Design a protein around this ligand. Structure first.
Ligand SMILES: C=CC(=O)Nc1ccc(Oc2nc(Nc3cc(C)[nH]n3)cc(N3CCN(C)CC3)n2)cc1
Length: 248
């Protein structure tokens, strides 16, 4: 019964999803308004997001319980990261900015890890970007760990698998993993121990990190806090003699 607000207090301005809007709350604060079909399940369907609070996670500000439904949240300047990587900023990005982006989210997930939650669909489409290349965790077998796609063993260690796949999206400016292979072909070949090669111009030492997130044994995959610290320290500890190339 807390968080609750009057419906007059939030003006919805521009559509985004299919719904989700940009607006204003108390005629001041800029906000993202995740509507509800009244519904659609609908009051099922929030407390999940009220239980979690962190800088690299997206924030719930307030709600409307009785129908029709409304949820208000932090607005992210630059939209979802998959669109940002392929589109105009795609061609200008480089390793230094790409590894910082990757570090920030590793932070988000190290909160979720510490809090004993599990996200279950970490990937570029579900990260949001803001001003100053700020990125945050928000709200498909190719991204999904084996245990999870097959047998439903979703854990924090299935999220880190998905992370390493997200590392490949950063490195190809947002290409779908496993170029030219459909989901059934991925599933069987990955069971063989196949794992994507080193992308062009991406240094071998980062490809190793990718390969460590993708181990066939969940336990052996590293923590998010290891993952954060490693990407934080990259250009001093790992590739001190890095040199700008044509894409990276
Ligand atoms: C049904 C939609 C869904 O599950 N997720 C979703 C929601 C929105 C979305 O697009 C989007 N969310 C935004 N900000 C948000 C969203 C939230 C929840 N906080 N801040 C901003 C945005 N832009 C796209 C193009 N830009 C030039 C203007 C801004 N798009 C893309 C995917």
């Amino acid at each position: 019964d807390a968080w609750e607000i009057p419906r007059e207090s939030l003006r919805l301005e521009v559509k985004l999803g299919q719904e989700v809007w940009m607006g204003t709350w108390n005629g001041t604060t800029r906000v993202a308004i995740k509507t509800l079909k009244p519904g659609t399940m609908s009051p099922e369907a929030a407390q999940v997001m009220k239980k979690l609070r962190h800088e690299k996670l997206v924030q719930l500000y307030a709600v409307v319980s009785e129908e029709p439904i409304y949820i208000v949240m932090e607005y992210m300047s630059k939209g979802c990261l998959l669109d940002f990587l392929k589109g105009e900023m795609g061609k200008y990005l480089r390793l230094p900015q790409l590894v910082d982006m990757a570090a920030q989210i590793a932070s988000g997930m190290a909160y979720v890890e510490r809090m004993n939650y599990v996200h279950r669909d970490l990937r570029a489409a579900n990260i949001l970007v803001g001003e100053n290349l700020v990125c945050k965790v928000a709200d498909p077998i190719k991204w999904t760990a084996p245990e999870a796609a097959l047998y439903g063993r979703f854990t924090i260690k299935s999220d880190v698998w998905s992370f390493g796949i997200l590392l490949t999206e950063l490195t190809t400016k947002g290409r779908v993993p496993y170029p030219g292979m459909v989901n059934r072909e991925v599933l069987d070949q990955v069971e063989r121990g196949y794992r994507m090669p080193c992308p062009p111009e991406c240094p071998e030492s980062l490809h190793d990190l990718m390969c460590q997130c993708w181990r066939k044994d969940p336990e052996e995959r590293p923590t998010f806090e290891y993952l954060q610290a490693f990407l934080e320290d990259y250009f001093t500890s790992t590739e001190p003699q890095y040199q700008p190339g044509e894409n990276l």
